[PDB]
Design an enzyme around this catalytic site. Structure first.
Site, mmCIF file in Angstrom:
data_model
loop_
_atom_site.group_PDB
_atom_site.id
_atom_site.type_symbol
_atom_site.label_atom_id
_atom_site.label_comp_id
_atom_site.label_asym_id
_atom_site.label_seq_id
_atom_site.Cartn_x
_atom_site.Cartn_y
_atom_site.Cartn_z
ATOM 1 N N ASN A 91 -106.228 -102.562 38.903
ATOM 2 C CA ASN A 91 -106.190 -101.270 39.572
ATOM 3 C C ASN A 91 -106.898 -100.177 38.792
ATOM 4 O O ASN A 91 -106.848 -99.020 39.205
ATOM 5 C CB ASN A 91 -104.748 -100.852 39.897
ATOM 6 N N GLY B 1 -91.020 -104.330 29.887
ATOM 7 C CA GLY B 1 -91.311 -102.922 29.751
ATOM 8 C C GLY B 1 -92.223 -102.681 28.568
ATOM 9 O O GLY B 1 -93.360 -102.223 28.735
ATOM 10 N N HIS C 53 -92.446 -101.275 33.718
ATOM 11 C CA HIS C 53 -92.287 -99.949 34.296
ATOM 12 C C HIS C 53 -92.276 -99.996 35.814
ATOM 13 O O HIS C 53 -91.727 -99.076 36.436
ATOM 14 C CB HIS C 53 -93.392 -99.003 33.794
ATOM 15 N N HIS D 296 -91.856 -94.850 38.117
ATOM 16 C CA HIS D 296 -93.244 -95.283 38.264
ATOM 17 C C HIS D 296 -93.462 -95.821 39.672
ATOM 18 O O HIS D 296 -93.084 -96.966 39.976
ATOM 19 C CB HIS D 296 -93.569 -96.369 37.244
ATOM 20 N N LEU E 123 -95.051 -103.325 26.506
ATOM 21 C CA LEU E 123 -96.170 -103.980 27.163
ATOM 22 C C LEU E 123 -96.591 -105.242 26.419
ATOM 23 O O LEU E 123 -96.485 -105.358 25.196
ATOM 24 C CB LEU E 123 -97.329 -102.988 27.327
ATOM 25 N N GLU F 85 -97.809 -114.829 15.129
ATOM 26 C CA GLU F 85 -96.377 -114.573 14.957
ATOM 27 C C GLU F 85 -95.774 -113.830 16.133
ATOM 28 O O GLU F 85 -94.647 -114.130 16.558
ATOM 29 C CB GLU F 85 -96.088 -113.770 13.682
ATOM 30 N N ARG G 148 -85.798 -122.930 1.460
ATOM 31 C CA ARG G 148 -86.768 -123.402 2.445
ATOM 32 C C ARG G 148 -86.647 -124.903 2.631
ATOM 33 O O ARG G 148 -86.679 -125.403 3.761
ATOM 34 C CB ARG G 148 -88.188 -123.059 1.999
ATOM 35 N N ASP H 149 -103.061 -103.737 33.272
ATOM 36 C CA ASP H 149 -104.071 -103.477 32.255
ATOM 37 C C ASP H 149 -103.456 -103.222 30.884
ATOM 38 O O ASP H 149 -104.029 -103.619 29.867
ATOM 39 C CB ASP H 149 -104.930 -102.294 32.678
ATOM 40 N N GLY H 150 -102.302 -102.558 30.832
ATOM 41 C CA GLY H 150 -101.645 -102.321 29.559
ATOM 42 C C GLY H 150 -101.283 -103.609 28.836
ATOM 43 O O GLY H 150 -101.549 -103.773 27.641
#
Lengths: 676, 676
Positions: free
Chosen positions: A184, A113, A65, A26, A115, A414, A355, A154-155
């Site tokens: 961009n 990586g 990337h 990339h 996203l 979560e 629990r 943006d991703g």
């Protein structure tokens, strides 16, 4: 001036040449973000020769990337990564994988990586820094005052996990977090006009972030530096710096999706070099003036670390107990004999849900182990809350907690909780951090959980309401596939403790961990204390609970089904069948034991039946026949659901008897045996 | 006036009494949202006697824990749900489960409860309605003009999936979507001041939504109705209606987290009844005046549907071809012989990646099957794009597509894509919809995928780059656990086709499906066309590819590993070992075949070795020994990674030979045999 411009060109061309050598990767974002990377690294405090200095500023490349950019920075600054490693970008076995991995790359704080993850990791690094500073800093002793710098595209901004973490970071007033949006107009999917037309800046203001906009981030490094200075003045908000860039800046194909994710053409690379004053016949050039300029910054940073070491020595003199605690944590060691705080039970003690047992463990160990912090998401306070004697982690300005607090209110988030946990672990200082929710909704965080495993981070999910045992909420809430999913992921310990002693063993493993994430699958419903359980035996991951030297069958079970197996043993005795019982609280820990130990638990010469009220996947590793639940659950009182699916002493006994009959006249070897 | 107030009280008290009878569940939001539910249902067009009328308005309860409210509405309106069913709320086997399930509850459009899902499902219902209307409506023929009404709470607004879907819905200008935020300052986690202080309204404006605020939604049903009218006037934006309510309105414990998720005290219920004019000694009261008022609305809605049926008849006269197509879709039938469009290959044809084969299938079947729509998320256009001859689904105002389009640009939003796909399926009209991404990031959407299975929706994931075969992107992108996870989930077909004919069989199954979601695991790398494959044989899920009557071993494989097994067979022949090969493109489809068919594929009396380059979990169902990959991958050229892990003809042959030797002198029965 000129060396700065030369450095930027060097970064750009190293990244492009790395992609070219691999014929993969990339180039676009490295070209667009080189000015910002240069400006940010020049403001950062770090030591390439000591990647673990606890007061370093941290950098995270969320748009992973673009890692040819990160690797170029690390090489230029003299981390343990060279031009020869860059030439091996995306090549099998190299130190320069196609997405950055903290286990393999010096100077990669986290594995990014996928996203959205890195910005959330940055939130966690910043959260940890604030908690750490609140715990240790004193007047004239700024032990911790570092920043967290994140690049994202943006991703990342489209992935919901980043919205979760950004809402929370704004709420938490994390003023040492400074994120940079690569504005961009491109993502992997194409132009942002197609699917991403929201007003990002307005959204970030709605979360309570500060905004700085840099309209010409292709060239204006003065403005990028000034944006950092401005962000540092806003101490009660995380800052988003909008970097308006041209993807692939300089390329013939700049400003197009074509430069996002494929190598440039050779003639394009030639014209890049000539217009920036480089030799188009040369690849991987590093002008010595760039090295000199970067070395000067390193030398200054090393003097800052040297002074920090002296501050730390003076801190130990003035605050002897805090200083020794800090030293121990920086050495990666838990308090001596901390595990003496783990609760121990006997078979005379009352039945308790695991629990509740888990919450009791946490209440005993949190006061004794300062590096434990944690929280919950999508879970009522009655199912998990802070340990008595602590407060929530909140900015003091809210009146609801303090940064010295220990319990994080993640909200109904979560996935971000999972990725923030990874960032807290990545901070270091021996942080052992946990996150509570229902087991079925750990699945909402799978993206981050897998990265915990790949990154080798010792995070812990406190995952209650593990099965149909939760009852009335019904099949939308009842795990079936969930343990199989995470057990099938490399490097995840999945503890399903049956009782009080096993729950303490699960926490001993989770807190001692340094390289393996843990998921603790815990019950809503009460379970008896078992005859034969102990922390010692359960710490082996699997152990013989009831030994029967003349066994016709061994029943191997986990969690709530161990008591069921013990009750089935009694039914079988009335049918003339002698059974043993094995408890297998963690399959990964068991697998790591010696072959001889494992065979002592699962010997040759006897049929073995597994019992666990969810998927049968994986269980053939340990059993010849499997009684599980491979359909969705039901909405009703839990005991009635168990009866419906024949998870009763009689139903187990029936299947055990059928197993004995099926192997009559057959030679049976341990499930642990294999052809290869 | 008075009957409206009585109806609201009736709804509130039915919900509280249902929770009381179960001694489990959530009374708070039903109390707070009863006014809004009354107002919305009075504006909705629906037929309780025809839950599938295609022009009905749809309602979705995204805050699914509040389902006592939904069930009360359905009972009062005379759906196939009664007061006797309400008395069995949260009881095993009832029609009133603790969270609503579309398979079990008449009038439940989707399965909700897992937070965030329902609003995304609503986005998909609205997306489908817009696509459907664009396809069929003509002048004077408003075949489709219905609205999608969604209730959601603070928990849904914190879950990242809802941010994804809300950003996308704003971009898509979905003006027939009207969502209502229960602004009650509470979630499951506690008071919103603790973790949820963002400006929700400002965020929704940033997405391009219209906002209406109702400041007194505890009483002001006039304003709620007016908000709906206002929303209907804004045809180019989805609308968020802020309903400021008191959780638990009327309870002694109103406005506290304690009424969120536990039954009220008996004395509290008594005072609710007396102050609203009901008998505190009576439960499940339904005043006949309320029934009368609701019946009047039903009768009016039934006359609207009757007129719609006549409009549809007139449409068939004027538009004979469109009318017949619509009728066929409403009958749930695909076009006659549609499958003749599926590509067929021979062993003389070139090697092709199954990603490319899949895109070719879609390109051939989309023009022939109008009810196929789909899209992609987090995936370059070169890896999937729209079929030639179609346009993207976009509002025409953007100039980038039209609502008649067929390909959805989801952006980098896998989880929302998954939940939107569920909503498109839920719309009905035979929609067969798909979503493309990398297989490893289907995991980001696990919350929605599991709901596809539980809801029995025929959605399809087009999941490329299935393994280490993707190469250079490395272990962050390479699936290991992913198929095991989804195969372990009930009711998911997981197709991993080996070649062209198998890829066509996978699509035949996915498109014909009516109750089972599909995941198609597809390759980056080229694979040969196999001797012995066909659509017919692959449609059985598993089949004998290479029959060997004197087999020493059978190798069972999927996907890219089938060709590997065939090459290993040749190596084994040189070692004096005769192998057969089985291809298992879908384990679920195979499991559903007859026992005799399955035994013809996996017979007794011969060792069976599985080969698949990811987790070995599940494979013992079909094999005695398993060769898989149970560690993370690597960043390099794919053939070199296969060599590293010994997924080569020689490596398979070595393990096959060891398997033959391990079973020398042993009696071997089919893995399909079981003791019970």
């Amino acid at each position: 001036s000129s060396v700065d411009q030369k450095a930027i060109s060097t970064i750009r061309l190293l990244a492009v040449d790395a992609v070219a050598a691999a014929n993969s990767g990339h180039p676009g974002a490295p070209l667009g973000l080189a000015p910002a990377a240069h400006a940010v690294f020049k403001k950062m405090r770090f030591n390439p020769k000591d990647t673990k200095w606890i007061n370093r500023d941290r950098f995270v490349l969320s748009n992973g990337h673009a890692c040819a950019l990160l690797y170029s920075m690390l090489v230029l600054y003299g981390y343990d990564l060279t031009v020869e490693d860059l030439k091996k970008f995306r090549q099998l076995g190299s130190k320069t994988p196609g997405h950055p991995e903290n286990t393999d790359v010096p100077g990669a704080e986290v594995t990014t990586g996928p996203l959205g993850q890195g910005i959330c990791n940055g939130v966690g690094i910043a959260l940890a820094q604030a908690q750490f500073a609140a715990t240790y800093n004193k007047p004239d002793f700024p032990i911790s005052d570092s920043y967290t710098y994140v690049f994202l595209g943006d991703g990342c901004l489209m992935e919901g996990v980043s919205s979760e973490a950004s809402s929370l970071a704004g709420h938490l007033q994390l003023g040492n977090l400074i994120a940079f949006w690569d504005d961009n107009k491109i993502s992997i999917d194409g132009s942002t006009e197609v699917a991403f037309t929201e007003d990002v800046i307005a959204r970030y203001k709605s979360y309570g972030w500060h905004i700085v906009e840099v309209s010409d981030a292709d060239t204006d490094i003065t403005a990028i530096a000034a944006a950092i200075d401005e962000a540092k003045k806003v101490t009660n908000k995380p800052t988003l710096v909008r970097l308006t860039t041209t993807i692939g800046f300089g390329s013939l194909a700049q400003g197009t999706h074509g430069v996002f994710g494929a190598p440039l053409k050779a003639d394009d690379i030639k014209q890049l070099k000539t217009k920036w004053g480089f030799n188009p016949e040369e690849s991987f050039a590093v002008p010595a003036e760039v090295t000199a300029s970067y070395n000067e910054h390193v030398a200054e940073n090393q003097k800052i670390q040297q002074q920090w070491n002296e501050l730390f020595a003076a801190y130990k003199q003035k605050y002897p107990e805090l200083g020794a605690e800090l030293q121990r944590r920086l050495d990666g060691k838990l308090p001596e004999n901390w595990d003496k705080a783990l609760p121990v039970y006997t078979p005379a003690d009352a039945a308790v849900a695991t629990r509740k047992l888990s919450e009791i463990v946490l209440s005993k160990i949190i006061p004794e182990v300062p590096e434990i912090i944690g929280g919950s998401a999508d879970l009522t306070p009655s199912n998990l809350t802070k340990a008595k004697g602590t407060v929530d982690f909140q900015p003091a300005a809210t009146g609801l907690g303090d940064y010295s607090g220990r319990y994080i209110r993640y909200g109904v988030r979560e996935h971000a909780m999972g990725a923030i946990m990874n960032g807290i672990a990545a901070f270091g200082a021996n942080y052992k951090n946990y996150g509570g929710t229902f087991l079925n909704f750990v699945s909402y965080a799978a993206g981050a959980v897998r990265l915990s495993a790949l990154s080798e981070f010792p995070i812990t999910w406190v995952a209650t309401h593990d099965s149909i045992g939760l009852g009335e909420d019904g099949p939308t809430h009842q795990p079936i596939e969930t343990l199989a999913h995470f057990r099938a992921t490399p490097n995840i310990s999945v503890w399903r403790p049956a009782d009080g002693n096993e729950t303490s063993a699960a926490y001993k493993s989770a807190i001692e961990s340094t390289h393996t994430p843990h998921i603790l699958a815990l019950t809503r419903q009460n379970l008896p204390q078992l005859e034969g359980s102990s922390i010692e035996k359960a710490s082996k991951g699997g152990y013989t609970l009831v030994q029967q030297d003349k066994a016709d069958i061994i029943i191997v079970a986990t969690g709530s089904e161990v008591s069921l197996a013990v009750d089935a043993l009694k039914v079988l005795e009335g049918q003339g069948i002698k059974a043993g019982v094995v408890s297998l609280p963690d399959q990964l820990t068991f697998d790591k034991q010696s072959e001889e130990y494992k065979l002592s638990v699962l010997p040759d010469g006897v049929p073995i039946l597994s019992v666990e009220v969810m998927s049968t996947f994986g269980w053939s590793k340990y059993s010849h026949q499997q009684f599980g639940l491979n359909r969705f659950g039901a909405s009703g009182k839990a005991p009635e659901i168990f009866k419906l699916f024949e998870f009763t002493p009689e139903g187990v006994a029936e299947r055990a008897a059928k197993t004995v009959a099926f192997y009559k006249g057959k030679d049976v070897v341990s499930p642990l045996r294999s052809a290869f």
